[PDB]
Design a protein around this ligand. Structure first.
Ligand code: ZN
Length: 105
């Protein structure tokens, strides 16, 4: 009934409820960036229809031992979150901004 996450702005297919990842205990991580913008971030093992731009950066990574690149919606270019990589258990994952996704069948 509510297993697919789409881009809230354009409906681009991004992930599935089944791909939710409970990093460090819970799949919901409330984090702030250096600009002080708070994000409810949901961790996914897998995502699709994104465009990863920029170089991977360790600077300000919310997750110890992970570099992040910016994840845009491949369709509309809305900032949906980050790809994380360079870590362990697992090596990679996605941090997507809950309020920029729409859940549905
Ligand atoms: Zn979009």
């Amino acid at each position: 009934g509510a297993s697919i996450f789409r881009c809230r702005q354009c409906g681009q297919t991004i992930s599935r409820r089944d791909w939710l990842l409970p990093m460090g205990g819970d799949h919901e991580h409330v984090v702030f960036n250096p600009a002080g913008m708070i994000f409810r971030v949901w961790c996914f093992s897998l995502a699709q229809g994104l465009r990863l731009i920029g170089a991977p950066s360790g600077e300000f990574s919310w997750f110890k031992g992970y570099d992040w690149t910016i994840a845009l919606c491949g369709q509309c270019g809305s900032h949906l979150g980050w790809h994380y990589e360079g870590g362990s258990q697992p090596q990679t994952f996605f941090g997507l901004i809950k309020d920029r996704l729409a859940e549905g069948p």
